[PDB]
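Hi support team,

I'm opening this ticket because the web form for multi-chain structure prediction keeps timing out on my end. I have pasted the exact lines I submitted so you can reproduce it. The total is 836 residues across three entries, so I didn't expect it to be a heavy job. Is there a limit I'm missing, or should I split the entries? Thanks in advance, R.K.
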Amino acid sequence: SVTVKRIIDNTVIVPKLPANEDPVEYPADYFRKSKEIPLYINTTKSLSDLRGYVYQGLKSGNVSIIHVNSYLYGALKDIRGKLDKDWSSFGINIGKAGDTIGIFDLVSLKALDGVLPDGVSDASRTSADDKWLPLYLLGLYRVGRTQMPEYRKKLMDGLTNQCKMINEQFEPLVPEGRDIFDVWGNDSNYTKIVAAVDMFFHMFKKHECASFRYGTIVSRFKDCAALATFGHLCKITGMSTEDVTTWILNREVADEMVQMMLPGQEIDKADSYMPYLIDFGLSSKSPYSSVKNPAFHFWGQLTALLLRSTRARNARQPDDIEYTSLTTAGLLYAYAVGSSADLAQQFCVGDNKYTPDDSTGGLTTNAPPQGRDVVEWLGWFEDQNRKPTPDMMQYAKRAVMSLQGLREKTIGKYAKSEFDK
Amino acid sequence: SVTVKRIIDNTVIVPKLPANEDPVEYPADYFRKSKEIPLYINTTKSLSDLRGYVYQGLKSGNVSIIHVNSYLYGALKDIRGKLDKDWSSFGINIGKAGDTIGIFDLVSLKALDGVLPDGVSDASRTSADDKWLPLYLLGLYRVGRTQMPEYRKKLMDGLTNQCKMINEQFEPLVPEGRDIFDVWGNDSNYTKIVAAVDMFFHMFKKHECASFRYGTIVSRFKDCAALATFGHLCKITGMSTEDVTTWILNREVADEMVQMMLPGQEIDKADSYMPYLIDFGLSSKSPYSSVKNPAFHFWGQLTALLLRSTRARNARQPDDIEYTSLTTAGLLYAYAVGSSADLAQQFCVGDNKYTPDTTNAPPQGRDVVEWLGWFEDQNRKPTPDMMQYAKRAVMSLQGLREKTIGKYAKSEFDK
RNA sequence: UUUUUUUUUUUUUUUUUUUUUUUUUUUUUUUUUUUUUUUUUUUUU
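Hello R.K., no limit was hit. The queue was backed up. Here is the completed structure from your submission:
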């Protein structure tokens, strides 16, 4: 309808509305530009010194990020790990058959000049070093993310990990909520280390030091929720990835989907850079984020909730998506899966059940399709005047009533308002 | 009916009522007049000094706006940012062709003479300067707007931002509510800076200092709510902008609409001056305001509420609009969209579903004409199903502030 | 006794402001107050 007129007086009006941008950036379409990920670990002073500046700065309640980065690089240059097979991503050849490589085999540059305390702090601290101190430093990255009292839930475990080798304790005193170390995550160089470590131990899963993954793990797939919700959807319906896809039933979800499955981005790859696209700063607007995939995110989570997901009762309810239609589509999917059990004899002793029996005996009209086929159901749905039948509605009610403790703006609370009146 | 007579005695009466004015002012119809936006950053004394007068005045509990403006101009003349493509708005050619430009490439004049403390304050403060001090100053603009305890919600984040570089803390002590800095927003020169900064970093989205956008952002589209509600309406119904338009069903909403879509105002433009029409003082009565688009604003928000918007349960309920009719029209729109799911197979494996296969059964899709007609058939009075639809949309809403269209909606439909 | 709205008037008549506002919306990115890994009956000589 490129053209709209106003009837009263036959004048043209040209409906337009403010431009929005934030185009996503994929990982591949970046190793076009550079062919290395720069890690500006700056000053290169003694490790013995650095071990000091931190062990102090920590107990103190302030310590330069610049210092901790430098210390980490220091205690982590263990060139451990022997390449099982080969290894390469996005063209970059990280190593190969049994080469020996270490964490920072992901691209080190140095820089700047200014620091803090002079040359050499308090010698008091020894090689109660690598062992555990780095783990702490990395641990805090995880803790620095959660905005809620749950943080002290993690820190608890964050140290009841820790105790392993020396049995120390707390270091700061100040809660968090953003101010303390909670802002380390804002240091492009810090994150790059966290990512490099996680990506590294994800490969050498078995390694005395692979315990460092604690707290370094919440960097893997950071800002890739949509991919995850898609994964859960499959697991939770029993359907294949291609079958689940066909059940997508509104454009902007298909749009979203197409956007996520763009090829040659290595998402199905074992150990690639793609999962850390954010923390290595490969991309500044993830294509797989839940906020750039709102329609999908809603549909997928609402559906899983109707199918009894626990995860899904607390997902966030995006804004500016087409709710009513998104949820009608979810209901249907949920209803189809919900009433047609896979159900098929699996083992036997000489006597199977052949499902056959002259498969026609009950309702032939408004009895809904047998299996889980989009076409059968779409058609059945047409037959129903494209308006949810009372049973579906009943299905939804019995899935959302008896949910309790629902945070507002979650799709849990949305679902319960919509269906359990 | 230019003529009204009184039956009892055949005398003419001439109904008239008080004149109202506030005609709107568009942005374009202004770069007719001037061709520059004047920024009277006054005194031009040392930055080192200024850094002082504020760092003091702040911790104190009073500091001249005049000073802070000057300080800002001081720490912000970073001529950073290299023009990606070209850049021009309303005729004004801001930059070009790989040019390098900085924030204040939007028109500086100087003025007046009088100030406050003498020449040089407390040297105590250094270049813990640009880094973070300006951000604070700008941050306050945002905080200075909200009239509610939510302000300390923003200031919280307003500093837990802050904490990056230096880790400082509070500066005033006195809450807010209009008195402290909450009045900086009244300084035509202050705002002009806020706008210039926002408009600048909206262009150079990627820039070490682009973090300054915090708190400078609520100036973008300030007093342009109607435009926003129209955008949400589209997003929330799934309809195109031209299709949504056709669902407008009462004159004064069409009037309103026509007013908003006046051409050559650059509203669909990426980075124009239009969004900052108020803070650059391009216009003193926005055409896009919610108060100059009441009917639209009501209709648009009511409809979105029926369609499950969360945003919309708290919109304000304008006065002096035609409620009953405005809401009948909204209901219908909401009912149409609400019952006809887009619903269409999108991916396949060799076997698509071809959709191919009464009286008071309502139209199939979402077409105004089909529905208008169906509605005629219904004696232009909402059927029991619609009414039911409305109820199930508004009951189970809780926590409604009064004068919101949330509360209006719940009173009308969930008896 | 004579009185009688616990009425008053003087003007009034939104415990409305119009100057601009109107999601007690938002840096951005983002969103199970998920997860180290192993487990996961606050089962047991």
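A quick check on our side: The two ends of chain A are 39 Å apart (CA to CA). Let us know if the file doesn't open in your viewer.
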